[PDB]
Amino acid sequence: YNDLRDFLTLLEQQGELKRITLPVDPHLEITEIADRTLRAGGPALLFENPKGYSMPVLCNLFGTPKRVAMGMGQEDVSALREVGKLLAFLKPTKRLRGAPCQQKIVSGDDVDLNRIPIMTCWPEDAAPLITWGLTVTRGPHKERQNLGIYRQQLIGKNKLIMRWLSHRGGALDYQEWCAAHPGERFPVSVALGADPATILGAVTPVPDTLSEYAFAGLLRGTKTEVVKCISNDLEVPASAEIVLEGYIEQGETAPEGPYGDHTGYYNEVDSFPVFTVTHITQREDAIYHSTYTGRPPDEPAVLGVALNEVFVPILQKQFPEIVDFYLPPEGCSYRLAVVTIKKQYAGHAKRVMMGVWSFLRQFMYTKFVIVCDDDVNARDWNDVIWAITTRMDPARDTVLVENTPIDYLDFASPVSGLGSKMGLDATNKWPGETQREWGRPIKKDPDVVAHIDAIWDELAI
Amino acid sequence: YNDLRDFLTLLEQQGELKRITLPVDPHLEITEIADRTLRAGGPALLFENPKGYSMPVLCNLFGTPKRVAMGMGQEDVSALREVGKLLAFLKPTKRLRGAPCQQKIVSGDDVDLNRIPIMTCWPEDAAPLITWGLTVTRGPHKERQNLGIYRQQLIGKNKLIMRWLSHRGGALDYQEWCAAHPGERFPVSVALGADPATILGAVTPVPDTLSEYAFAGLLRGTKTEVVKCISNDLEVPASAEIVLEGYIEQGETAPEGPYGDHTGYYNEVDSFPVFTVTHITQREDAIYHSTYTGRPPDEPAVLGVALNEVFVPILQKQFPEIVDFYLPPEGCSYRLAVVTIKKQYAGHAKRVMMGVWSFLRQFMYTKFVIVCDDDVNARDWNDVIWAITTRMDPARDTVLVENTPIDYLDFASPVSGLGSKMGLDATNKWPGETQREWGRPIKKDPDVVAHIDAIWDELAI
């Protein structure tokens, strides 16, 4: 639906947006509330009263599954499947100017970032943290562009940190910019508070054949209204609320953190490049879209559970035996995985593990995989825990693999960025696998299950 | 190129076909020769003199790599890559009658298979073995058809064995035919001595979205000339030399073997369905296309090395780090694999192993995987053996995985169809992986390598 405010109004109508008029602190307070809400499951929150401020602070926007699907075109969290039928089958822009995004420009020394209500998220964080900027960058060589969400710690008056992670095509953009034009400044533009369509295209992997304004905008019904930036010849989305324009001074970096991670812990200080902003271009009643992360759940963590319903089809195409796949938010949205399969032969559950650990680059860091038959609900601990404890001999049934790629930040692994993984084969063991008669699992009649649904309300309990 | 005889003539021109006028026995003799030829590398062999017979016996047709590529349209074994760019990007027929294939029909009791020169391949085989029939079958439910090469041991006067392997969509065709119409005969048609285009489409995996007359025939420049069979309403290719038509009597089966496998060993007797042929329809100077397998090399084994150059692109799309991939014929064309990569981080070689073991269903049974950097030639034992012995601590560097899917026939695995695998990480170890300074490998100047090529002939040695 159109631009961010157009989407905004839809929610407020159906009781999916909430209006807080009370004075709320960007320092830790707005965070605390959004967690209470998300942990129990309230609506999105808009804050027309930041304490000592006057710019609205929007958080918890995609804070439950339903906020995502409506943000994609539908009502049913079932057509998130169809978003994923899309990316595996693939195996367009529209420019403006006096476009709403740049109506108010503040350049040069007038640039004071203390003017915006950036969230200070948790107890011993460093400075306040810009958590929801959609970073735009260009490769010097080609022309095709790159989006990304990095956490942007404000250190100075108009200085910001680019916490990008080496691998990202976004980081690779800067690296090749110093390489071809050495000692020369690298233009970046980070756009804030955007429309639903490109925003869910920003937390998503696309094959490098199609731009992520073309996929993202065609999750909406309308091709992407974009624009030239004032200080550079790279594109920011037009539906924007605040747009940041600057460059990174070559060699110049600052100490970053501590910050709490969605891991539930404090990242220890480590240094990163300084994006210096020469322009802050905005609307009027302009908004600033924001979030946070911590000991899971959190917004990304739900956004994560959201995202993965999208992956399922991709996985299913490649792995038809996979009935269902799911990474819990308890396990940092990515560290543990339950897969459920139609088992087709002894040994089967291992083909699946190694598949999971390798096929998608997202799932390359997943320490724990638990594979069970299609009569186990992946999404329920009752089932999975039953699964594990009735259907496995632990030593017989556990794949342990060593010296594999693991997070540079995961302090549990024996060395930095190299640790071990564990598969759990909790599938019923066919012969070859066991020499004992296996148990006949109680299975429920789908009929009886069906009749009792028609009756469930008109039974009120 | 057109139909099989049209392709046949091209070879004989460039010294790639050979004419044996001497009396040769289908029992073991024609086999022995084709092995001598293939082991050193002679041409294809046509036998206008089978001993006690008069039908030509064609073997060793794709017996070296070059015979394959010309059979696909080109001269360079480099555009076999492009055959594989095709199958991953995809992620049409033309009927005749008095078509050459059915000019001579022998039905009913006149059907005597002792009329054909079926090869008796190795020492203590069972009966003679029809090794190169392209089996056609239809699913009763849908309409879309299936091709496959199974080994067809003649037991009786007009009786033949269907050695199909449960998984095959071809076998699944028969299983669903007994299921919907029980106690009812299952029509099959097996076409012999066909044109290059559908023949290389017969030893190939296609996604079930496109028929394998449509892929196969469009490896040629001409859409597939096909036909209705006389005794059934399923299609055989028209460019055929002999076409077999019959049905399988439900429940009826015979003891199969012993036979030597491309494994280099004798398969022990195990029972399979009996395809009873009511019609043998042929041309006149009709031919019968044939081969054999044994302790590798052999035709399939080269055909295997042929096939895998096709897989490389598919693998590369999914695995951009893979410089090269290759399964040796010494290792039964499928049991061992060398992969070479641009290593991008510690742990990397394991992401590759598990990928190899899982991504493609062909490579799910591969006991041994050896991964090395891109400065090792996968195709050379000199390099790989050096690789292993300079770049690995064996216990540190070997992934052992247990209880995985393995061949039902591989008698080395501890139980039937369930055995273990071994990855070998022979990549240079980056820090994290080793705490020692690694060696600086001697690398050759590509310039010096280039200049010495221009000189190699005009140096004659």
Residue A257 backbone dihedrals phi, psi, to 5 degrees? 95, -165
B311-428 and B429-461 in the same fold? no
Helix ranges (H only) for A276-407 are 299-318, 348-356, 381-391
CB-CB neighbors (< 8 A) of A417 in chain B: 345-347, 432
Q: Is A261 a catalytic residue?
A: yes
* Chain A contacts in chain B segment 101-130 (CB below 8 A): none
Q: Are B396 and A415 inside 8 Å of each other by CB?
A: no
Local structure of A46: helix, strand or coil: strand
Q: Does B422 touch chain A (CB under 8 A)?
A: no
CA–CA min distance A363, chain B (Å):
11
Non-local CB neighbours of B244 within 8 Å, separated by 6+ positions: B133, B160, B189, B190, B191, B192, B275, B277, B279, B280
What is the residue-wise DSSP string for B23-76? -B-TBTHHHHHHHHHHHHT--EEE-S-BTT--S-EEB-TT-SHHHHHTTTT-S-
Residue at token pair 């001074």:
A249
Q: Are A348 and B405 inside 8 Å of each other by CB?
A: yes
How far is residue A49's CA from residue A20's CA, in Å, rounded to a whole number?
7
CATH architecture of B311-428: 3-Layer(aba) Sandwich (3.40)
Q: Are B347 and A91 inside 8 Å of each other by CB?
A: no
Q: Are B351 and A415 inside 8 Å of each other by CB?
A: no
Residue at token pair 């052999």:
B298
How far is residue A165's CA from residue A149's CA, in Å, rounded to a whole number?
11
Name the token pair of B224: 């597939």
Topology of the domain covering A429-461: 1.20.5
A320 upstream amide cis, omega within 30 of 0: no
Name the token pair of B333: 């064309």
Let me know the angle formed at the C-alpha of B128 by B124 and B133, rounded to the nearest 5 degrees. 130
Q: Does B171 touch chain A (CB under 8 A)?
A: no
Binding residue numbers of B for prenylated FMN: 149-151, 163-165, 168-169
CB-CB neighbors (< 8 A) of B348 in chain A: 405
Cβ-based contacts under 8 A for chains A and B: 93
Q: Are A401 and B401 inside 8 Å of each other by CB?
A: yes
Between β-strands A336-341 and A368-373, what pairing exists: parallel, antiparallel or unpaired?
parallel
Q: Does B343 touch chain A (CB under 8 A)?
A: no
Q: What is the CA radius of gyration of chain A?
A: 24
Q: Are B354 and A354 inside 8 Å of each other by CB?
A: yes
Class of residue B188 by CB neighbours under 10 A (exposed 0-12, middle 13-18, buried 19+): buried
Q: Are B417 and A347 inside 8 Å of each other by CB?
A: yes
CB-CB neighbors (< 8 A) of B91 in chain A: 88, 91
Resolution (A): 3.2
Q: Does A318 touch chain B (CB under 8 A)?
A: yes
Class of residue A386 by CB neighbours under 10 A (exposed 0-12, middle 13-18, buried 19+): middle
CA–CA min distance B267, chain A (Å):
20
Does A168 count as an annotated binding residue?
A: yes
Domain boundaries, chain A: 1-310, 311-428, 429-461
Q: Which residues are registered as beta bridge partners of B416?
A: none
How far is residue B237's CA from residue B99's CA, in Å, rounded to a whole number?
10
Residue at token pair 């080793």:
B434
CA–CA min distance B449, chain A (Å):
29
Q: Which residues of B are identified as catalytic?
A: 261
Q: Does B405 touch chain A (CB under 8 A)?
A: yes
Q: If we measure between CA atoms, which residue out of A138, A193, A142, A211 comes closest to residue A170?
A: A138
Structure determined by: X-ray
